[PDB]
C-alpha cells in the first residue's frame, strides 16, 4: 500500500502514500499497462461534493469543525432540491489550483499555487465570453512577463446548455489544405480552420494566421471573434549564430492557453475553463515545428546548415533539431517573453516532486508526458520513477464540441 519511487541517477527514494486517496481509474489492469495510451445526477453528485469539501476544509485546518459541517449540510440541501450546487469563491479557487496540482502530465506544476482564477460564472453570452477571454489573454501575457491564469465559465447543468470554447487553444495558427495536396500553416488545426471558414471567417490564407475564437454560450450556436492583434504577443524566431535563420519566416505566439478541457470540482463540471501558463521551449521547437504532421521544418533547416542528409546515421535530423530549439529559446529571451528550457523545467519538476512527497505524501506523474521529446536521458526526470494515478479535482479531456453539439 505504501509505494516507493527511486531515481536511478541520484539514488533518492520517496515513499508514496497519496495514491491511496486516489479516485478515478487509470486504464491499466493487473494484466496490461496502458501508460502510453493518449486517451484510455442527485444520487451521484453528493458524495463527490462531500469528498471535495472534506479535502477543502482539511486544507484550511477546519476539518471536523462547525463551519465544515454547516457547509456540508447547506450543500446537501441545495442538492436535494436543485439537482446541483454552487461553489463558494474560496472553493472555486482552491479547486482550480488543485486541478493543476493533480495534472499528472504537467511538468510545470511547481507553480501550481500561484494561479490567477477569474471567476466568469456570471457570464451568459458568447460576447460575454469574448470579453472574459480578451481580459484573460491580456492579464496572462502581461507585456511578455507571463502569469498563469484560468477563466471559469458556468458549470454544466443539463448538458444541452454547455459553455464551450471550440478552439483547442485560445491562440493557434490556421491550417489550409491545398490543390496540390500539401498543407499551409498548421495541419493540426486544418479541420478547425474549415469549421471557421464554414461559419464565415474570411481567412487570409497565410502561414501564421491567428485563428478566430469560436465560442458557444449556453448551448447555443457558437460565434466568431477576432482576438485583437495587439493582444497576441508573437515572437519572430531567429538564431544567435546563424544570421540566415531569420529568413525561414518563422514566428510563434507567446501565450499557450489550453481551452478544450473540462475542469471537475466536487462533481461539478466546468466545460469551458481556458487556462494558460507559459511555454517550455521544446513544445514549439520540437513538436510544433518538427512533428511530421505539424510544421515539419527539419528537412528545410538541415538544408541551410549544409549537413549530410544522405543517411539517417549522420544524425542530421538531430543536429538541426538542436539549433531550432536553441533559436526558439534565444528569440523568446532576447524579446523578454517568459520561456523555460527543458533542462530547467525538468530540474524544477524534480524539486517539485520532492516537495510534494514531503508535504503531501506524493505526486501523480506521467513519465511518458513529463520526459521532454528531446534529450530525454540528459534531463533528470528521465531517471526518475513516477507513479501515475488520477486525483480529483482535475482536468479531463472532453469530446471536440463539433461531434457533440446540436445546431
Ligand X SMILES: Cc1cc(N)nc(C[C@@H]2CNC[C@H]2OCCNCCc2cccc(F)c2)c1
Binding residues: 36, 106, 169, 278-279, 283, 368-369, 382, 397
Query: Does the footprint of a copy of itself cover residue 321 (CB under 8 A)?
Result: yes
- Rounded Cα distance between 31 and 23, Å, is 20
From the list Zn ion, ligand H4B, a copy of itself, none, which binds 369 (C-beta under 5 to 8 Å, kind-based)?
ligand H4B
Query: Does the footprint of ligand HEM cover residue 319 (CB under 6 A)?
Result: no
Query: Does the footprint of ligand HEM cover residue 396 (CB under 6 A)?
Result: no
Give the count of alpha carbons within 13 A of 173, CB side only.
Answer: 21
User: At closest approach, how far in Å is the CB of 8 from ligand X?
Assistant: 6
Stretch (H or E) spanning 152? strand 149-152
Q: Which of 372, 393, 394, 401 binds a copy of itself (CB under 8 A)?
A: 372
109 is catalytic: yes
Q: According to CB under 6 A, which residues from 322 to 341 bind ligand HEM?
A: 340
User: At closest approach, how far in Å is the CB of 147 from ligand HEM?
Assistant: 9
**4, 116, 266, 271, 273 from 71: Cα distances, Å:** 37, 25, 13, 25, 25
Q: Which is nearer to ligand X, 40 or 206 (CB)?
A: 40
From the list ligand X, Zn ion, ligand H4B, none, which binds 279 (C-beta under 5 to 8 Å, kind-based)?
ligand X
* Cβ count near 127 (within 10 Å): 13
Q: Which of 104, 271, 276, 379 binds ligand X (CB under 6 A)?
A: 276
106 is catalytic: yes
From the list Zn ion, ligand HEM, ligand H4B, none, which binds 383 (C-beta under 5 to 8 Å, kind-based)?
ligand H4B
Where is the chain broken, named by the residue before each break, C–N > 2.5 Å?
A: 40
123 is catalytic: no
Q: According to CB under 6 A, which residues from 129 to 148 bind ligand HEM?
A: 148
Query: Does the footprint of ligand HEM cover residue 106 (CB under 6 A)?
Result: yes
Helix (H, G, I), strand (E, B) or coil at 95: helix
Grid coordinates given for 15: 515513499
In the complex, which residue's CB is closest to Zn ion? 33
Alpha-carbon dihedral sign for residues 328, 330, 336, 340 = positive
Per-position x/- string for 339-378, each x denoting binding to ligand H4B as judged by CB under 6 A, each - no binding: -----------------------------xx---------
In order, the DSSP letters of 227-267 are: PPGGG--EEE---SS-GGGGGG--EEES--EE-S-EEEETT
Q: Which of 15, 35, 82, 89 binds a copy of itself (CB under 8 A)?
A: 35
**26, 112, 160, 266, 273 from 261: Cα distances, Å:** 18, 17, 17, 16, 7
Stretch (H or E) spanning 165? strand 164-165
Per-position x/- string for 30-49, each x denoting binding to Zn ion as judged by CB under 5 A, each - no binding: ---x-x--------------
Q: Which of 87, 92, 107, 328 binds ligand HEM (CB under 6 A)?
A: 107
Stretch (H or E) spanning 15? strand 13-16
User: At closest approach, how far in Å is the CB of 146 from a copy of itself?
Assistant: 16
- Rounded Cα distance between 43 and 187, Å, is 44
User: At closest approach, how far in Å is the CB of 98 from ligand X?
Assistant: 16
From the list Zn ion, ligand X, ligand HEM, none, which binds 105 (C-beta under 5 to 8 Å, kind-based)?
ligand HEM
Instruction: Yes or no: say if 406 and 33 are a contact pair by the CB < 8 Å rule.
Output: no
User: At closest approach, how far in Å is the CB of 289 from ligand X?
Assistant: 11
Burial group, residue 202, by CB count within 10 angstroms (0-12, 13-18, 19+): exposed
Q: Phi, psi (5° rounding) for residue 386?
A: -135, 145
- Rounded Cα distance between 270 and 164, Å, is 9
287 is catalytic: no
Burial group, residue 340, by CB count within 10 angstroms (0-12, 13-18, 19+): buried
Q: Which of 254, 84, 104, 270 is nearest to 172 (CA)?
A: 254
- Catalog residues that contact ligand HEM under the rule CB under 6 A: 100, 103, 105-108, 111, 115, 148, 150, 258, 261, 275, 277-278, 280, 283, 340, 345, 369, 395
Catalytic residues: 106, 109, 278, 283
- Catalog residues that contact ligand H4B under the rule CB under 6 A: 8, 36, 38, 368-369, 382-385
- Catalog residues that contact a copy of itself under the rule CB under 8 A: 3, 5-6, 8-9, 19, 22, 25-38, 281, 286-287, 290-293, 298, 312-315, 317-319, 321-322, 325-326, 329, 333, 341, 343-344, 366-368, 371-378, 382-389
Amino acid at each position: 500500500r505504501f509505494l516507493k519511487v527511486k531515481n536511478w541517477e541520484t539514488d533518492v527514494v520517496l515513499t508514496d502514500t497519496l495514491h491511496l486517496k486516489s479516485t478515478l481509474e487509470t486504464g491499466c489492469t493487473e494484466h496490461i499497462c496502458m501508460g502510453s495510451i493518449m486517451l484510455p445526477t442527485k444520487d451521484q453528485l453528493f458524495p463527490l461534493a462531500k469528498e471535495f469539501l472534506d479535502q477543502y476544509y482539511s486544507s484550511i485546518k477546519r476539518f471536523g469543525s462547525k463551519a465544515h459541517m454547516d457547509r456540508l449540510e447547506e450543500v446537501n440541501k441545495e442538492i436535494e432540491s436543485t439537482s446541483t450546487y454552487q461553489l463558494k469563491d474560496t472553493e472555486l479557487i482552491y479547486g482550480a489550483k488543485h486541478a493543476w496540482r493533480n495534472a499528472s502530465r504537467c511538468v510545470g506544476r511547481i507553480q501550481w499555487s500561484k494561479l490567477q482564477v477569474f471567476d466568469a460564472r456570471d457570464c451568459t453570452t458568447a460576447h460575454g465570453m469574448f470579453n472574459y477571454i480578451c481580459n484573460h489573454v491580456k492579464y496572462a501575457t502581461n507585456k511578455g512577463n507571463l502569469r498563469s491564469a484560468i477563466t471559469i465559465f458556468p458549470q454544466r447543468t443539463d448538458g444541452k446548455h454547455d459553455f464551450r470554447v471550440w478552439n483547442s487553444q485560445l491562440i493557434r495558427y490556421a491550417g489550409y489544405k491545398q490543390p496540390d495536396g500539401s498543407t499551409l500553416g498548421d495541419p493540426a488545426n486544418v479541420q478547425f480552420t474549415e469549421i471557421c471558414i464554414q461559419q464565415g471567417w474570411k481567412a487570409p490564407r497565410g502561414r501564421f494566421d491567428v485563428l478566430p475564437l469560436l465560442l458557444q454560450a449556453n448551448g447555443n450556436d457558437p460565434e466568431l471573434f477576432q482576438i485583437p492583434p495587439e493582444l497576441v504577443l508573437e515572437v519572430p524566431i531567429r538564431h544567435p549564430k546563424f544570421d540566415w535563420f531569420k529568413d525561414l519566416g518563422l514566428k510563434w505566439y507567446g501565450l499557450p492557453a489550453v481551452s478544450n478541457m473540462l475542469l471537475e470540482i466536487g462533481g461539478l463540471e466546468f466545460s469551458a475553463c481556458p487556462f494558460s501558463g507559459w511555454y517550455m521551449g521544446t513544445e514549439i521547437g520540437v513538436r510544433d515545428y518538427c512533428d511530421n504532421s505539424r510544421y515539419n521544418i527539419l528537412e528545410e533547416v538541415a538544408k541551410k546548415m549544409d549537413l549530410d542528409m544522405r543517411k539517417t546515421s549522420s544524425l542530421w535530423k538531430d543536429q538541426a533539431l538542436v539549433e531550432i530549439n536553441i533559436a526558439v529559446l534565444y528569440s523568446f529571451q532576447s524579446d523578454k517573453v517568459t520561456i523555460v528550457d527543458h533542462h530547467s523545467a525538468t530540474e524544477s519538476f524534480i524539486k517539485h516532486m520532492e516537495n510534494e512527497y514531503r508535504c503531501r505524501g506524493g505526486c501523480p506523474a506521467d513519465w511518458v508526458w513529463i520526459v521532454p521529446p528531446m534529450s530525454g536521458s540528459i534531463t533528470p526526470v528521465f531517471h526518475q520513477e513516477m507513479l501515475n494515478y488520477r486525483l480529483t479535482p482535475s482536468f479531463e479531456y472532453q469530446p471536440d464540441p463539433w461531434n457533440t453539439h446540436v445546431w
